[PDB]
Amino acid sequence: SCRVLPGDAAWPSSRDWAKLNKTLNGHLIATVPQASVCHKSPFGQYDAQACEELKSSWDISTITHVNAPGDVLSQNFQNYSCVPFTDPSQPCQLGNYPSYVVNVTGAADVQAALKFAQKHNVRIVIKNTGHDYLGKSTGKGALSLWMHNLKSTKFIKNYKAPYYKGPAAKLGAGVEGFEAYAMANSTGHRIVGGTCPTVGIVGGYTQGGGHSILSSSYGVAADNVLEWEVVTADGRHLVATPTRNSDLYWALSGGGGGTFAVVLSMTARLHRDGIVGGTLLGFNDSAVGNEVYWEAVAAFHALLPDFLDGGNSFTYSVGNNSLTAYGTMPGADRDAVDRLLRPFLDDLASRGITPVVQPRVSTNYYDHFFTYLGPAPYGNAAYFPFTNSRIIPRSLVTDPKSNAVVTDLFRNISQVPAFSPFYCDSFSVADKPHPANSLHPAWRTGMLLCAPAGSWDWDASPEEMAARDRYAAETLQPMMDAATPGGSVYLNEANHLYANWKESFYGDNYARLLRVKKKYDPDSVFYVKTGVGSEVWDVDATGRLCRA
Ligand SMILES: *Cc1cc2c(nc3c(=O)[nH]c(=O)nc-3n2C[C@H](O)[C@H](O)[C@H](O)COP(=O)(O)OP(=O)(O)OC[C@H]2O[C@@H](n3cnc4c(N)ncnc43)[C@H](O)[C@@H]2O)c(*)c1C
Ligand SMILES: *[C@@H]1O[C@H](CO)[C@@H](O[C@@H]2O[C@H](CO)[C@@H](O[C@@H]3O[C@H](CO)[C@@H](O)[C@H](O)[C@@H]3O)[C@H](O)[C@H]2NC(C)=O)[C@H](O)[C@H]1NC(C)=O
Ligand SMILES: *[C@@H]1O[C@H](CO)[C@@H](O[C@@H]2O[C@H](CO)[C@@H](O)[C@H](O)[C@H]2NC(C)=O)[C@H](O)[C@H]1NC(C)=O
Ligand SMILES: *[C@@H]1O[C@H](CO)[C@@H](O[C@@H]2O[C@H](CO)[C@@H](O)[C@H](O)[C@H]2NC(C)=O)[C@H](O)[C@H]1NC(C)=O
Ligand SMILES: *[C@@H]1O[C@H](CO)[C@@H](O)[C@H](O)[C@H]1NC(C)=O
Ligand SMILES: *[C@@H]1O[C@H](CO)[C@@H](O)[C@H](O)[C@H]1NC(C)=O
Ligand SMILES: *[C@@H]1O[C@H](CO)[C@@H](O)[C@H](O)[C@H]1NC(C)=O
């Protein structure tokens, strides 16, 4: 009826766990949260010096945190169970963290863990980096398939398929953005990946869609997938391609992580590298007042279409008084950058704004990326646990009427100090060749992906963070939704309590996604919150998974 929890009569004995540990060649880990050094029981590992080092970067996406077996990055899902900022005498508890972690070395480890979990009625969790904003990579009382260490990279000079011919990279499931970029750069190529360097490229990133500053040139991450190597729920080690287990390939390419199969690697398109044009472009209200500022943002938005259609992108911060943008202009030299920027600069000029404009040309993509989103290799990307999103259709922006509503939404969010400023990315991803995939159609009509993100506050109460959580899901996200009809919520950047997840994340694709889910996982061994087919499991008050 329900998944077993620590404390249950039916929880596996330590002998059961040892027997799994043997099968796994010693690769079972009992979860000990990284902040156990900040507490006294039950791990008896208290260390004030090490506790203090954890504090200064805890709210950053760091390699240190990503390297922990059972930790996730979300302060909200940590949920004060074993964190560096509570009383030392407060017991270091697992809470939402999995009980045991399978340190996966290949297909056999997964097959073993799946057999064990199915024999013993244990919840499977899948964790790669722990970046998930929706907690989809933790679970109380769970055995976790920890994919972080599957780091193999393989350059394929001449991938040969009817629908793709050219360079490709086969990447293990734990390969992170910075690893993918180092690997692609060394061969004279670019790969489509996230702006946050520590993000797992093969994980929930590509599986859930995956936007990039390179998307205007090469589509979303999932568009660039050639092959998925997987283990299915019943333990079959398979390869999914457009011409083999194609329905699984379709679901995995934009249908979301952690529900269809356990991914061991992906093979993806590489693209020839070269000169990359870049800029800082910033403007504020200090000379024109706030009203002209918001009209200038409205106009900046309206001016994107031709810039994006030329293969370029803007990633930018929208504040209450200033906008700061970083431009990505692949293959553009300095004269080309200038011509590309001239419409935006003329618009600001006509509105009495003196922008901050800092154009450059990088030799390669890697250099461009880490100039703007560094430092290399890990970056410095803050973790905001109340991340929401809207994919905003081009047609909304290009009509002044509907664009006014878009602008008015951004003004409203700018008044909410925990959610301001916020980042947007801009892209054109229609009419590029890619295989059939399950990527939400709003991506094709979309021009903006904006992520209003609420920071965590270690001085605030738990009740205040819980209130911020409910605010994001039931007030801020629906306000965003209503202001942008025909758009959608990016499944990777949403709140776990957001009520309209099914329609907004998946849309009309959902029936077919559900058919694929029932084909490859008929017993629903894979569960993630807001995942395809997740409505099979209820989460009770204590956090136990029970069959709906
Ligand atoms: C934390 C963070 C996230 C970001 C950042 N920047 C992004 C950007 O510029 N563009 C984007 O499109 N997305 C950005 N994201 C979000 C990530 O795209 C999502 O948060 C992804 O879900 C991240 O995936 P991953 O790195 O794998 O993190 P996990 O929490 O480990 O997994 C998420 C999800 O996927 C399942 N899963 C992962 N790996 C597997 C394998 N191998 N097999 C099966 N299932 C897998 C997990 O179960 C979970 O459900 C910038 C920042 C700072
Ligand atoms: C942080 O930890 C607390 C536990 O201290 C979690 O609170 C629990 O949250 C769930 C869902 O919000 C509550 O379940 C609800 O129970 C009622 C019956 O009482 C049921 O009718 C509802 O449908 C729902 O399932 C639960 O009561 C609550 N428990 C307590 C003690 O507050 C919280 O979810 C954790 N936060 C995160 C982000 O993990
Ligand atoms: C599962 O098996 C391995 C057996 O080696 C355990 O890993 C060892 O853990 C001890 C601590 O007790 C360390 O001192 C060693 O470094 C590890 N062994 C080796 C050979 O390196 C692991 O702890 C076991 N886990 C569980 C949950 O039973
Ligand atoms: C998870 O498993 C991997 C592979 O068994 C471990 O990687 C080894 O770690 C040691 C350092 O402790 C290195 O000297 C070896 O070169 C690594 N082996 C391989 C094949 O990469 C990894 O340390 C384990 N991690 C945890 C947290 O248990
Ligand atoms: C990227 O690759 C080139 C050769 O392809 C190499 O010379 C250069 O050092 C690399 N850059 C970085 C920053 O690793
Ligand atoms: C606003 O823009 C002006 C002119 O570009 C610049 O000098 C100034 O530093 C900016 N102010 C803020 C607060 O960003
Ligand atoms: C902005 O705020 C007003 C007043 O609170 C509200 O009525 C309106 O719906 C909001 N506008 C948008 C575009 O969401």
DSSP 230-249: EE-TT--EEEEBTTBSHHHH
Write the residue with the smallest CA distance to atom 8 of ligand 3.
Answer: 26
Helix (H, G, I), strand (E, B) or coil at 144: strand
- Phi, psi (5° rounding) for residue 413? -65, -40
Domain extent at residue 228? 153-273
Q: Find, among 218, 229, 171, 174, the residue nearest to 198 by Cα.
A: 174
Q: Are 461 and 496 within one domain? A: yes
Residues contacting ligand 6 via CB (< 6 Å)? 284, 286, 322, 354-356
- Could you give the CA distance from residue 221 to residue 216 in angstroms, rounded to a whole number? 11
Structure-token match 């060649």, residue found: 25
420 token code pair: 């301001």
Q: Are 326 and 281 within one domain? A: yes
In the chain the first and final C-alpha atoms are separated, in Å, by 9
Q: Give the burial string for 278-305 (b: 16+ CB within 10 Å, else e).
A: bbbbbbbbeebeeeebbebbbbbbebbe
User: Is the Cβ atom of 466 under 6 angstroms away from ligand 3?
Assistant: no
- C-alpha R_g of the chain: 23
Q: Find, among 142, 137, 145, 136, the residue nearest to 2 by Cα.
A: 142
> CA–CA distance from 138 to each of 55, 74, 95, 171 (Å)?
22, 10, 10, 23
Helix (H, G, I), strand (E, B) or coil at 323: strand
Structure-token match 């959580």, residue found: 469
Is beta strand 262-269 parallel, antiparallel or unpaired with respect to 271-272?
Answer: unpaired
Q: Give the burial string for 504-530 (b: 16+ CB within 10 Å, else e).
A: bbbeebbebbbebbeebbeebbbbbbb
DSSP-H helix ranges across 198-325: 206-207, 215-218, 246-252, 290-309
User: Is the Cβ atom of 26 under 6 angstroms away from ligand 3?
Assistant: yes
> CA–CA distance from 538 to each of 1, 37, 173, 506 (Å)?
11, 34, 28, 20
Per DSSP (E only), the strands in 368-454 are 386-387, 390-393, 422-426, 446-451, 453-454
Q: For residues 252 and 261, is the Cβ–Cβ distance under 8 A?
A: yes
User: Other CB atoms closer than 10 Å to residue 317's CB: what's the count?
Assistant: 15
CATH classification at residue 74: 3.30.43.10
Structure-token match 């990039």, residue found: 212
CATH classification at residue 442: 3.40.462.20
The Å distance, Cα 480 to ligand 5 centre, comes to: 42
The Å distance, Cα 281 to ligand 1 centre, comes to: 29
The type of residue at 302 is: A
Q: Which of 405, 414, 479, 481 to mutate to test the pocket of ligand 7 (most atoms within 8 A of CB)?
A: 479
Please identify, by atom number, the ligand 7 atom nearest to the C-alpha of residue 408.
13
Which ligand lies nearest the alpha carbon of 34?
4
Q: Are 289 and 334 within one domain? A: yes
Evaluated on CA atoms 483, 489, 493, 496, the torsion sign reads positive
Q: Find, among 205, 156, 203, the residue nearest to 183 by Cα.
A: 156
The Å distance, Cα 67 to ligand 6 centre, comes to: 39
Q: Find, among 270, 17, 302, the residue nearest to 143 by Cα.
A: 17
User: Other CB atoms closer than 10 Å to residue 198's CB: what's the count?
Assistant: 24
User: Is the Cβ atom of 28 under 6 angstroms away from ligand 3?
Assistant: yes
Domains identified in the chain, total number? 3
The type of residue at 352 is: G
The Å distance, Cα 22 to ligand 3 centre, comes to: 10
Describe the crossing of helices 14-23 and 107-120 by its angle, rounded to 10 degrees.
Answer: 160
> CA–CA distance from 439 to each of 42, 254, 262, 510, 524 (Å)?
45, 5, 19, 11, 22
Q: Which of 199, 328, 532 to mutate to test the pocket of ligand 1 (most atoms within 8 A of CB)?
A: 199
Q: Are 250 and 390 within one domain? A: no
Describe the crossing of helices 177-186 and 365-373 by its angle, rounded to 10 degrees.
Answer: 150
The Å distance, Cα 542 to ligand 2 centre, comes to: 7
415 token code pair: 């008044």
Q: Are 140 and 163 within one domain? A: no
Q: Find, among 193, 185, 190, 201, the residue nearest to 166 by Cα.
A: 190
Method: X-ray
Please, which residues bridge with residue 391 across strands?
A: 449, 488
Burial environment of residue 307 by CB neighbours within 10 A (0 to 12, 13 to 18, 19 or more): buried
Which ligand lies nearest the alpha carbon of 25?
3
The Å distance, Cα 376 to ligand 5 centre, comes to: 13
Q: Is residue 1 part of a domain?
A: no
User: Other CB atoms closer than 10 Å to residue 459's CB: what's the count?
Assistant: 6
Q: Are 533 and 417 within one domain? A: no
> CA–CA distance from 68 to each of 64, 375, 376, 445 (Å)?
7, 22, 21, 39
The Å distance, Cα 27 to ligand 1 centre, comes to: 23
Q: For residues 303 and 344, is the Cβ–Cβ distance under 8 A?
A: yes
Q: Are 323 and 455 within one domain? A: yes
- Could you give the CA distance from residue 169 to residue 187 in angstroms, rounded to a whole number? 10
The Å distance, Cα 194 to ligand 1 centre, comes to: 10
User: Is the Cβ atom of 262 under 6 angstroms away from ligand 1?
Assistant: yes
Q: Is residue 370 part of a domain?
A: no
Please identify, by atom number, the ligand 5 atom nearest to the C-alpha of residue 370.
13
Q: Is residue 6 part of a domain?
A: no
